[PDB]
C-alpha cells in the first residue's frame, strides 16, 4: 500500500481540484477517481467532508517562502489537518517552482510540525535536498501545471526513484491515462493530477480512466516486463 | 461495446497464448485479463472451454497463402468456427508479414465464409485493401512480435483509424501497459496481446495490468483529453 507520513492509502491517485469547473461534476469525478486524498487550494471542504476524502490544503500561488508558511499556518488553524502541499512558485507564466524559496518553506514547516508534501521540479539534487530536510514525499513535476504535455523527462524521473527513501508522486502535466500509466511505470509510487480530468470534455471518464491508468500502471512495475529487442 | 462480425465483446483486450509457459498460470493470466476472445495457434482448448473464453483459430508460422487456407480450413473443421487470425509471415527473423500472400489469403477465407482478423502491417493502403477484401477488423502491428517495442508509428495507427469502416486491432509488440493505453488514446477499438503477458516475470499481475491499460485509454480516448500547451 502507498504509505505517506502516517497514513496508508489504498489508491495510488491524488487529485487536485484547480480548474474544476463546477461542484457536482467534481463530485462525480471525484468518486470515479477512486481517491482518498484531494488537494484543496487555500462548498468544497464540505464535499470531500461528505465523501470520506482526506483534504490536502495547498499553498497555490505563494510567491515566497514566507507566504507559503502563513498560509499553511493559518490553514491547519482552520482545518485542523497538520499535512500540506507546498507550492512556491516563481514565475505566472511557467507556474515554475522557486527552488530556494521551496526548500526554505520546507524546513520552516517541518520545523513546525506540518508533513510537508512539495511541488518540485525533476532536479535530483533538489528532490534530495526536500527528502533530507524532512518532506514525507518529494512531487516531482512532469511538465508544467495545466499544459498537458506528459513526462517530458523520464530519465530524471528514474534517477529521483533510484535515489529516493520517501515515496515519489509525479505531480503535474498529466494529459491522459498513457502519461499516469508511464509514471507508475518508471517507479513512482503515485501520481497526483487535477488539469486532465477536471477541464477534460468528461470529467468523471476521464477520472475513471486515470484511476484504471495507475492501477495498470502500478501493476506493470511490479510484473517485471519483457526486455526490449531488435529482432523479432 | 466492441463489435466484429457477428459477436458483441464486453473486453477490448484480445489474448494470444503464445510464449505460454504452463497451462496453470496461462489460466491464472486468462481469468486476470478479463478477456473473451483468445487465439490459439492451429489442453489448451479444454482450458478455453471450461473458462468460457472465445477461441480464435491462428495461422502462425505459415508462409504462403496456400498454407494459410489449409490450415485455416482444417481448424474450421475440427474446431466448429469460422472465425480466424489470418497471419502470413515472410520472414522469420522478423516475421513480418507477407502482404501480398496475406491478401491472396484473405480473398479466399472471405469467399470460404470466414470472419478474418488479419496481422497487417502499419501501411493505411494495405489496411483498406483487406476491409476492402471484406476482413471483419483489421490489426496493425505496433512492432514486431515478442519485440516489447510499443508502438513504434503511432501516426500511421492514426491514419488507419481514419480511414477505417471495420474495428481496428493493434496486434504485436506491446511491452507494457502505457503501450496498450497509447494504442486506445490512438483510437484503436481493441488491443491483441500474448507476449508482455506470458514472458512476464509475474503473467497474472500483468495480465491485470493489461485489462485496466486498455479500459484506461479507451475511457481517455472519449472522454476529451486537454489540447496540449507550451506555457502553463
Ligand atoms: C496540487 C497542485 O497545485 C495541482 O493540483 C496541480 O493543478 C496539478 O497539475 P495538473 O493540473 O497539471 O495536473
Ligand atoms: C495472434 C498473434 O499471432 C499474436 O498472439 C502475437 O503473439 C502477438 O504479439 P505479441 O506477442 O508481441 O503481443
Known amino acids: 500500500k502507498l504509505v505517506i507520513g502516517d497514513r496508508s492509502f489504498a489508491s495510488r491517485l491524488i487529485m487536485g481540484t484547480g480548474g474544476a469547473t463546477?461542484?457536482?461534476?467534481?463530485?462525480?469525478?471525484?468518486?470515479?477517481?477512486?481517491?482518498?486524498?484531494?488537494?484543496?487550494?487555500?462548498?468544497?471542504?464540505?464535499?470531500?467532508?461528505?465523501?470520506?476524502?482526506?483534504?490536502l490544503p495547498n499553498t497555490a500561488g505563494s510567491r515566497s517562502a514566507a507566504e507559503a508558511v502563513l498560509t499553511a499556518q493559518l490553514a491547519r488553524e482552520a482545518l485542523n489537518t497538520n499535512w500540506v502541499k507546498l507550492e512556491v512558485i516563481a514565475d505566472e507564466r511557467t507556474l515554475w517552482p522557486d527552488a530556494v524559496e521551496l526548500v526554505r518553506a520546507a524546513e520552516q514547516l517541518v520545523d513546525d510540525g506540518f508533513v510537508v508534501l512539495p511541488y518540485?521540479?525533476?532536479?535530483?539534487?533538489?528532490?534530495?535536498?526536500?527528502?533530507?530536510?524532512?518532506?514525507?514525499?518529494?512531487?516531482?513535476l512532469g511538465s508544467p501545471i495545466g499544459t498537458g504535455l506528459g513526462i517530458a523527462n523520464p530519465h530524471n524521473i528514474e534517477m529521483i526513484v533510484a535515489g529516493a527513501r520517501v515515496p515519489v508522486v509525479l505531480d503535474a502535466g498529466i494529459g491522459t491515462a498513457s502519461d499516469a500509466?508511464?509514471?507508475?511505470?518508471?517507479?513512482?509510487?503515485?501520481?497526483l493530477?487535477?488539469?486532465?480530468?477536471?477541464?477534460?470534455?468528461?470529467?468523471?471518464?476521464?477520472?475513471?480512466?486515470?484511476?484504471?491508468?495507475?492501477?495498470?500502471?502500478?501493476?506493470?512495475?511490479?510484473?517485471?516486463?519483457?526486455?526490449?529487442?531488435?529482432?523479432?
Open 22 to 55: 463546477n461542484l457536482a461534476v467534481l463530485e462525480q469525478a471525484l468518486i470515479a477517481s477512486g481517491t482518498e486524498l484531494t488537494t484543496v487550494a487555500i462548498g468544497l471542504l464540505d464535499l470531500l467532508n461528505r465523501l470520506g476524502i482526506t483534504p
Open 120 to 140: 518540485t521540479t525533476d532536479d535530483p539534487v533538489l528532490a534530495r535536498r526536500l527528502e533530507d530536510t524532512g518532506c514525507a514525499a518529494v512531487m516531482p
Open 181 to 191: 500509466a508511464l509514471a507508475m511505470e518508471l517507479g513512482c509510487d503515485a501520481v
Open 193 to 232: 493530477l487535477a488539469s486532465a480530468v477536471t477541464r477534460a470534455a468528461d470529467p468523471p471518464a476521464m477520472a475513471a480512466a486515470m484511476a484504471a491508468a495507475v492501477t495498470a500502471g502500478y501493476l506493470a512495475r511490479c510484473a517485471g516486463r519483457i526486455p526490449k529487442r531488435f529482432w523479432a
